[PDB]
Write a protein that binds this DNA or RNA. Structure first.
Lengths: 83, 58
DNA sequence: ATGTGGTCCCCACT
DNA sequence: TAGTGGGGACCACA
């Protein structure tokens, strides 16, 4: 809700949430703010999970995995809305 | 040298990491945190399970 | 002995 | 030249 930074990168309001600008120049990726604080946008999937996830991505025909995550979240909307 | 395993896919071996766009990450972590999971991988497990009906129509 | 999660740099591209 | 996706390496650990 309020704050320029956690105390930390500059906090920037976006649609539905907030991003955090990189704190340096060797790596300029933005992070995101979440209920548990700043988080990296990159995640490591376990082998079992990765295999299933890329099967979904490949069957969708999507080049970028993030778009397949978008699709999954849409298709799960019913279950998400119940927590 | 790194010792992380890759996984077999229809397009060849693939690294197990995914970079999420900012908007996707914000929505994804909302799901993960509302589920109470410490590891993101467990959240996409759950998304795949709950999207099964749609996945089977692919 | 060979993996793990998570992240730090870095390269090419915009 | 500011932010991107994704490769390779590294820390700490088992």
């Amino acid at each position: 809700l309020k704050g320029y930074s956690v105390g930390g990168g500059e906090i920037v309001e976006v649609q539905g949430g907030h991003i955090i600008r990189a704190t340096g120049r060797k790596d300029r990726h933005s992070k995101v703010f979440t209920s548990k604080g700043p988080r990296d946008r990159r995640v490591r999937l376990s082998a079992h999970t990765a295999i299933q996830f890329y099967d979904v991505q490949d069957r969708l025909g999507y080049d970028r995995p993030s778009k397949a995550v978008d699709w999954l979240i849409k298709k799960a909307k019913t279950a998400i809305d119940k927590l | 040298k790194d010792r992380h395993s890759k996984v077999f896919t229809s397009k060849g071996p693939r690294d197990r990491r995914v970079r999420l766009s900012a908007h996707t990450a914000i929505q994804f972590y909302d799901v993960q945190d509302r589920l109470g999971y410490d590891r993101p991988s467990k959240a996409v497990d759950w998304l795949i399970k709950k999207a099964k009906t749609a996945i089977d129509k692919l």
